[PDB]
Symmetry: D2
C-alpha cells in the first residue's frame, strides 16, 4: 500500500497538475488541470489503483479518467490514463493515455488520440 | 444527457459484463466482470462521462478504470477504457483500452496491452 | 508460410483497399487507398511479416507503414498497422494502428491517433 | 527533405540500435537490434517517411516495421513504430509503437503491447 505514496500533487512533462487522494479500498479521487488543449481550470477525476501490490520491486498499477467538462468549458472528450506508480526518492507515475472525442459515426476513425505522460512530485 | 441511455448492463464481444450507473454530474460507478484473463467475479469500476454532449449527432465521450483486485484475486494490473456512447436502437459503447501491469523497471517496456471493446445492451 | 494467403487485395471496414505482395523472406510491398481522411488514390506501403509462424493455430504477425504522400496530396503523416493474419474460409487481417502527424513540439502531445482496422478478402 | 538527417544510426532509451537509410522517394530500409525481449542480433526493417515535410517547424512523419524473425530466433511477433523526426542539434525520432504477437483467437485480446521509444543520435 502506496496510499500515502500516491496521495498528493503531481506534475507532468507538459506542466499539467494532477491532485489525487488514494483511498484504502483502491479509490482514486481528485482534480486535473491540463496545461494544454481545450481546457481551463480543474476537472474532476476518478480512478482505481492496486491497494495490495506485489512486494517484488514491481510498480503499482493504476488508472484514472477525466471527462473534459467543467463550469468553464466542455471539450466533448475524455482521457484515461493507465499506468504504474513507482515509489522511492524519485517517485513517478508512468502512464499511457487515450483521449476520445465524441464524434459522428463517419468521423469515429479519427476519434482517439494516444500519448504518454510521466508524473513527478516536483515541477 | 444520456444519463438514462448509459445506465444499465452492457456486454462486450468477449462476453464480459459491465454494470454502470451514470450520475447527473458526470460520474460513472459500477462493476465489471471479465470473461477472460486473470479475473473472477466482479470488480469495482469508476469513471466519467460528458453529461452535456454535442447535439449534432456526435457520440458521448466517456471512460472508466478497473483495478484487477477484488476479494478473490489480485492481477496487479489496471485497465482503462476510453470511448464513446452512441444511442439509438442499436446503442453501443465503442472503446479502446489500455491494460497496465505493475512491473519492475526492467520490464516496464512490456507493461501495457492495448485493445478495443464494443459494448452492447444485448448478449 | 502464408506467402500465398497474405498476397492479394484486402478491404477494411471503412472501405479502404490494401493491395500487398508477401515475399518469401518476410517482405510486404504494395499500395494502400484510404476511403477516409486527407488521401486520394494509392500510396506506397512496405512492411514485414513472420514467414515461419507457429503451427499451433496461432495467427501470423505482421505490420506495414504508409506515409501519406503521393503525387496528388501530402498529409504530412504516416500510419503503421500492427496485427495478425488469420487464415481459413473467412481469412482476416486484424490490426491496430497508429497515425502520427508531423507537428510542432508544442503540439506533439496531440500528434498521434490510434484505431483498429479489420481486413477481409471480400467487400 | 530530411533524407540526410534521418539516415544513420540511432539509439533508444532501452539501448536498442536502429540503423536506417532514407531514400529520396520516401523509403526507409535498415536493421534493428533490440536490447530487450525475445531478440538477438539484427532484424530487417522497412518503412516510409514524408520526403517533403512542412516548412513551418513541424516534424517529419515516419514509420517502420520489424518482424522478429531472423536466422537466430523467431519471436512470432512484429513491432511497428509510428512517429516523427525532429532535426537540429539534438535531433530525435519520437515514436509510439505497437507490438503484435501471433496468437490463437482465444488469446487475441492479449495480443498487442503498446509503448513509446525516443531515438537519439548519441548513446
Amino acid at each position: 500500500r502506496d496510499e500515502a505514496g500516491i496521495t498528493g500533487t503531481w506534475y507532468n512533462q507538459l506542466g499539467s497538475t494532477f491532485i489525487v487522494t488514494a483511498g484504502a479500498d483502491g479509490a482514486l479521487t481528485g482534480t486535473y488541470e491540463s496545461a494544454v488543449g481545450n481546457a481551463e481550470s480543474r476537472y474532476v477525476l476518478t480512478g482505481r489503483y492496486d491497494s495490495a501490490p506485489a512486494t517484488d520491486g514491481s510498480g503499482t498499477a493504476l488508472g484514472w479518467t477525466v471527462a473534459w467538462k467543467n463550469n468553464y468549458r466542455n471539450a466533448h472528450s475524455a482521457t484515461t490514463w493507465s499506468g504504474q506508480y513507482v515509489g522511492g526518492a524519485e517517485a513517478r507515475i508512468n502512464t499511457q493515455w487515450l483521449l476520445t472525442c465524441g464524434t459522428t459515426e463517419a468521423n469515429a476513425w479519427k476519434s482517439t488520440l494516444v500519448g504518454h505522460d510521466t508524473f513527478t512530485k516536483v515541477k
